[PDB]
Every structure is written in structure tokens, then in C-alpha cells.
From Swiss-Prot, chain A:
Protein name: Large ribosomal subunit protein eL8A
Transmembrane residue ranges: none
Swiss-Prot/TrEMBL keywords: Cytoplasm, Ribonucleoprotein, Ribosomal protein
Gene that this sequence comes from: RPL8A
Gene source species: Saccharomyces cerevisiae (strain ATCC 204508 / S288c) (Baker's yeast)
Family from the record: Belongs to the eukaryotic ribosomal protein eL8 family.
Taxonomic lineage of the native organism: Eukaryota, Fungi, Dikarya, Ascomycota, Saccharomycotina
Keyword ATP-binding tagged: no
UniProtKB/Swiss-Prot annotation, chain B:
GO MF term (any one): structural constituent of ribosome
GO biological process, one term: cytoplasmic translation
One GO cellular component, as annotated: cytosolic large ribosomal subunit
Keyword Ribonucleoprotein carried by entry: yes
Covalent cross-link (Glycyl lysine isopeptide (Lys-Gly) (interchain with G-Cter in ubiquitin)), residues: 45, 92, 118, 144
Modified residues (Phosphoserine): 51, 94, 158-159, 248
Record protein name field: Large ribosomal subunit protein uL2A
Keywords: Cytoplasm, Isopeptide bond, Phosphoprotein, Ribonucleoprotein, Ribosomal protein, RNA-binding, rRNA-binding, Ubl conjugation
Curated annotation (Swiss-Prot), chain C:
UniProt name for this protein: Large ribosomal subunit protein eL34A
Main function: Component of the ribosome, a large ribonucleoprotein complex responsible for the synthesis of proteins in the cell. The small ribosomal subunit (SSU) binds messenger RNAs (mRNAs) and translates the encoded message by selecting cognate aminoacyl-transfer RNA (tRNA) molecules. The large subunit (LSU) contains the ribosomal catalytic site termed the peptidyl transferase center (PTC), which catalyzes the formation of peptide bonds, thereby polymerizing the amino acids delivered by tRNAs into a polypeptide chain.
Encoding gene, per UniProt annotation: RPL34A
Subcellular locations according to the entry: Cytoplasm
Subunit structure: Component of the large ribosomal subunit (LSU). Mature yeast ribosomes consist of a small (40S) and a large (60S) subunit. The 40S small subunit contains 1 molecule of ribosomal RNA (18S rRNA) and 33 different proteins (encoded by 57 genes). The large 60S subunit contains 3 rRNA molecules (25S, 5.8S and 5S rRNA) and 46 different proteins (encoded by 81 genes).
Amino acid sequence: NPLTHSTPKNFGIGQAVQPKRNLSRYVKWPEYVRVQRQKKILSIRLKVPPTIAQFQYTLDRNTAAETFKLFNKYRPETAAEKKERLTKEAAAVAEGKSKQDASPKPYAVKYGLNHVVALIENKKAKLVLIANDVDPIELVVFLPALCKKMGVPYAIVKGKARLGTLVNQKTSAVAALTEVRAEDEAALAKLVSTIDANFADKYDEVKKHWGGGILGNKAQAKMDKRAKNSDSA
Amino acid sequence: GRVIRNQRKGAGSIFTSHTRLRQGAAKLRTLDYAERHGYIRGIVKQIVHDSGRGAPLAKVVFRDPYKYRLREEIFIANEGVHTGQFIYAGKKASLNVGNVLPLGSVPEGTIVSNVEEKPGDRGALARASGNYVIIIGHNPDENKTRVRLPSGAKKVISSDARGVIGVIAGGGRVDKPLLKAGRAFHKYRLKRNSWPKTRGVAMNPVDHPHGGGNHQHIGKASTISRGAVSGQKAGLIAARRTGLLRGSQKT
Amino acid sequence: RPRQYATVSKTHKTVSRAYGGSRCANCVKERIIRAFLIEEQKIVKKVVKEQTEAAK
RNA sequence: AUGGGGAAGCUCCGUUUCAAAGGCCUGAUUUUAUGCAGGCCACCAUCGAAAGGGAAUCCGGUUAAGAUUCCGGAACCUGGA
RNA sequence: CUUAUCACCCCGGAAUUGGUUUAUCCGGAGAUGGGGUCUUAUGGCUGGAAGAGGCCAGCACCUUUGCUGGCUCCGGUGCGCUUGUGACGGCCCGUGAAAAUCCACAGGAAGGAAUAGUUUUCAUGCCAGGUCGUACUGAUAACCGCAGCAGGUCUCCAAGGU
RNA sequence: CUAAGGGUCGGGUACGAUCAACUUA
RNA sequence: UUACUUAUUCAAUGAAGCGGAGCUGGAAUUCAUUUUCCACGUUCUAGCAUUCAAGGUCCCAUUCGGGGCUGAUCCGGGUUG
């Protein structure tokens, strides 16, 4: 035990070989990594028109979860359920002589941007969610303004992937409800009031609000250095 | 007329520099981390003659702060530097001949050489044999330092630009007459193909603006505008004055 | 010649001292004197700086 | 050459550049040889000398003509369990 | 196996300064002197290797073939010629490639006890070393100049006398 | 014909045979 | 003329240490525990500096000996001008 000793090395300017540290801050990230960062930075340093910044202005995850809990009970049919219902229908038309009315009417979340926009134009939308991760914002920019003038409740929601999972896809950019069963008409009405009070009723206030203009970490530090130098006396 | 001799130099076929025997680009070390918050010591292992350069060069071995490796650097040798000598590079390096202090760290009147034009360019000014830079003064607000260049020009640059304390070695080189075309021959064969020089007036008009005539004579004024084009810029280019310089120029 | 050092025995290429085949006797001797004396002087500078820890 | 950038385009520049450009030891060692936590990097193409640098051969004999190559002796170097 | 100028080590410690080159450099940072390693630098001896090769003498007497006997030994000389080497000295505002490749050193990861572990940088032993070139001329006739043209075309060796 | 000019040793505390080559006059 | 930087431009690096908060102390020193900035503890000398680092503190069948944290402060990922 006395055979040990205390070496300690000095990490001064020219004293010892510097230890291996976390150089993760100074990584020469690949080209595609660099674009992703500087693209998000550019979209935050610029005056983003109020058409944007109403996106990335979503509801809390507390609200998002309680919508989905209602939504998953109305998730559409799958390939497995279609096949088991198609042959059930085909067997039924012979035995019961029904005009495909033996199969029930689905109560399904109605997805698809072109379908949903037609839903909003016809007023057939009881509730519409919009994604914020649609990389060309052009496809969804008019959606809040479309949902407003037509008077349908809409919420801007986090996750185009979460929308894709809801509709058995990878991405959907919109989800919507048109008709809810008689058992839980109460749940939607209670939930729509919260959404209306959060997005649609503040739409005209969001229409004048610009985002962006935020500067970098070292930019704000210099900005505060202007303030403290000025206020010092 | 044909393309003239000074026009043909930009193609760089036979007018590229003869660089076989050179010891590398003489540069200060990279301004990395140590040079700007402390100093780093190194040893000059040899001072060697660089072909085509009047000034000697110094080979200096620094240690790598981040890895176990000896990093060699090719400094321009300042007068008095000897093999076996320590030279200290950084902001906290002492004001000694051979040290690589930033310009802002040295007092007024410091004699520096191989000075950076910008911090980190590894040295641009006062690099030829017997040349130096003087520190005229400092401007700490908007951190700067004004210096006197070998040509006499005044220049203000950032105080972080580094330089070697002292004067380049090999000074007094041009004090000896070459005495012989052969000595001028050997001088330029390790530099570039710029020698000998035929006068333009001894050419034909196809070859030079000065060529031709029943006597050897320029014929038109040898002072040429700055806005003249290539093939025309032979003589004294954009000359403010001409003739034997008498008196001073307030230098 | 450089390649014939591959087939010759170790005794020929070296000598029986520290740094034997790369630095001659007087250089390694100078390195030995230098190494000991600087480290000895380092302990001297270490205690000269250490007195201020007793002073304060 | 590539990366990349010009050029309507044949092509031009560029040669490490604003590129995600890297082996060897009992790792593992029985659907196994990469099904699976075993390190060092910071290499950046390639072509360009029959007078430059280079691993190692000599003597004697032999033919119509070859020989430091064949033959007889006598060596050396490189790779390989 | 042995053999060196240079270089280096140990030991008295030097002015009456000494040693010393053709050339004047070196010595208390240790001279002179006395003792001391290695590079087939280069030479000598031995092995190779006299059995080879060369010079004489004698037998073969039409199987496109040999056999025998000797000798091959000692030296000397030099501003000699040429080439190589060495230690030097002169020159330059000229200071007179690169890489492959090979080794060495620093270091201290790993591994080592019932016939074992490592040494395959010691000696000896075993196998392989492919491909393409290889004749000849190289010039008053083998190349180019319309040609077997008094022209042109790079280089090595270099006897005696005056 | 003459003269001059060199190399190689055994030291009781000035001595010789050997050997040698072309430069001068 | 300017209280800017992200567009564009320039220069380096194997994009290694940037901007703040700061941890014991120095200071022409506050009138109520932090209101700036620095050693982040290397300059006689042609030595040395590398093996997740030695040490230190809690843990393990301390079976090729190991793990975590800290030595080497935290926060922001703008590589730096």
C-alpha cells in the first residue's frame, strides 16, 4: 500500500499533455449536419411572418394526450380488419340479401390533406389537427385560416409522425374527426371548448404576431453587456 | 505586335519560382490556445541557409499540448539566435530576441520582425534579411497597434498579431557589389527566370512598346497610366514623379 | 547500407549503454547530468514557492 | 482522377481542396468466423528516371551465333510453418 | 582472423608555452606524454584455390576425343599514369533533390514454475523466387540526313619512347 | 667529368657498411 | 453617421479549449456577503513529459483484478476569428 505515490500532473499552458476531454462542442459535423443547424438558426434569426410562428406554437403535451386518448378509439381499419370484413360482407349479401348494409358505418379519423381541406370547405369537420413539421409549410399554412373562416375548431399539434401513427402511416400532416358516437359526444364537446379557447379564438390575435428575431447565445451576451455597461454608474 | 515579356510572366511556365532547395514556408506556429493565454517554450535545433533567400531560417521544435508529439516550426532567424536556445511563444512570453510576443504585449519602440498582418496569418511583414518592424504605439480602445514598416509606411493592425522580437539575420547583404554577371547569374537561378534583362529600346516594335527606331529611344513618355492595359504597362507605371530624387519626401 | 541492417545481429547495430545505438556516450552522459540537476533544481524552486503557503 | 466548382458543350480548373475519404492481436474464438461493447490513428488517389535512390553473384568452361542468364564449382538476398 | 587516418575513454596536469601539417591549427572546455575499441575503409594471411587458368616438355595417329610430366617462385622502385578512398583547405548575395526502403533508440502493454515457457536480431537446417528485355551495329556502310552521303549523333577503358 | 640536394639502427655515462631518385649548377 | 447579424465575403485548424457563471486570493478598494479583471498556480540549463493517469472517496466472491465520481468546476453545443 505504501508502494503507491502521488504524481499529479499539471494542466497549465505548457505543463503536461492535455487530458482527453469532451470535444463534442468543436465537432466538424458533416455537411448535412451543418445545414440542419444553420437552417434552424436562420429560421429563428429572421422575422418569421405571422403565417409561421403560429406553427411551432402548439398545445401542451397534457392536452395532446387527452385528445389522442379519445382519438385512438376512432382509429381507422387496417388490412387485417378490411379482409375479415370484406369476406364477412360478401358472405352476408348472399345469406341476408342486404345491400352491403350489414357491415357497419365506420367512425374513423379522417386524414389526408386534400380530403381534410374538402372536409373543411364543406364544413364536414367536427375537429381538425394540424402538424407543424411539414417541411414545405405551403401545404399547411392556409389551414388555420381555412379552419377559421369556415368556423370549424382546429388545433395545431406537435408531431406529423404522431399523426402518421394515428392514421397507420409514417406522416399525415393533418388528422380530423367528423362524427363521434353517441356514447362520447360529451368528451368531444368538452375537449373542443379547450381547443377553441386555445387556437381558434386567438387566431385573429396571432394574425398580427411576428416571431423570430432571436439572436445567438454570444449575441445576447453582448446585448446584455451593452445594458450593464450603460446602467453602471 | 506580339505579347511582350512582362505579359508572358503570368502564364507561369518558365517564370515560376525555383523551389527545390527551399526548406519550406517560413511561418510562425499556429495561434492555437497556448499562445493566447500563456506561452509555449521551444528549442531552435538548427539555423540553415535557405536557397534564394538572403535571410537564414530557424528550425524550432515545440511540444504538442494535446498529443505526445514534437512539432517542428520554420521560423525566420533573427540576428543573435543560436542553436540550443529556448524561444518562448505567446502572450506571456518575455521580451527577448527570438520570442513571439503579440504586438499589444510589447512596449513602444520594440523591434519586431516576421509580423502578422492579421492575428493567425503566421507572419507577413519584415521578413527579408536585415529588416524589422518598430512599434510606434498602441490603441487599446478598439484593440490595435500602429507600427512602422521597412518601406517607411505606417500601418495600424490588431494587437493580437504576433511577431518575432529582433531583426532578421543576414543584414547588410546588398552592401557588397556583385561585381560580375556570373554572380547575378547564380543569384537568380535559385530564384526565378528574371535575368538577364534585355532593354525594350533594344527590341523591335513587335516585341516592345519601346522597340524600333533608327536610334534606340523610347519615343513616347515612359510614364504609363494606372488605367493602361497589359502590353502597355512598360516603363514607369503610374509614376507620381520622375528624375533624380533630391531632398527628402517627409519620410 | 540501410538494408544490410536487417540481416545483421543486434550487437553490431548497438552498443551496451542507454541510448546505445542512437546517441554516443558523451551525449547520454550530458543528458544524465542535465536530467538529475534540473529535477534537483526543480525541488529547490518548489520549496521557494511553498513558503508562501506557510506565510499565509 | 475523385470531392467540388465552372463550361451550351467537346471539356476547363482543382490535387487536399468548404468530402461522413483509416490495420492486427489469444477480441469473438460450435445457425457463427465479423450473428456480436475488444485500440493507435487523423493516412487521402495514381502516373512520371532502362544515366537519380534501390535486396542479393562470382570465377573457370562452353557456342556457327547466348551468357555476370547455359554448365561445373563456390556464395548471397527476399519471402516462407 | 588481422589491419586506420579521424574520433573517443583512463591516467601524471602544461610559460622556458608545447604538439604539429605542404598548407597554422589545437590544448585547463585538459595539451604533450603513457595506456587503451568496431565497421574486409584499404591492405595482409588462410579458406574459396590450384583441382582453375596460364607457360613448357612428351605420348595420342582418320570411332567429329584425350592422357603424362613439370613450372606457375622470390622480390625492388616512384613528384609516374588513372581511378577510388581519406584527412584537409578554398569558393558563393550560388551553400549544392525527393521518396521508397532499412535499422536503431526511448517505453514498459503482454507473457512466462513437474520435463515446461520464450531465444527463429546466435548457429545450423528446409522450400520458392514468377513476368517482360538479353543476337548485332552503334557508324567514312547496320542511326538520321532521299544513299553504303568527307556532314550530324551521348559515354566507359587507355601501353612504350620523345 | 665535378659539386650540391636523401631514406632506413644496437647507445658502457658524435659514431658506420648499407641502400636510393632525378633535379639543378 | 450608427445601438446589429443571419444573407454574402475573407482566413485558419486533425474545426482543443469560445461566451457567460465563476471557485482560495491581488486591487488607487462596498458603507451590509460578491458591484470588473487575473494565477486557473510551468523562463539559469540543447534532459524528461504518451499506455481510460497517478492519487483520493464510496462499492465488488479484490478469479487476466475492477466499477462510479473526482482529479480535469458548471451552464450554452456559435469551431474560431
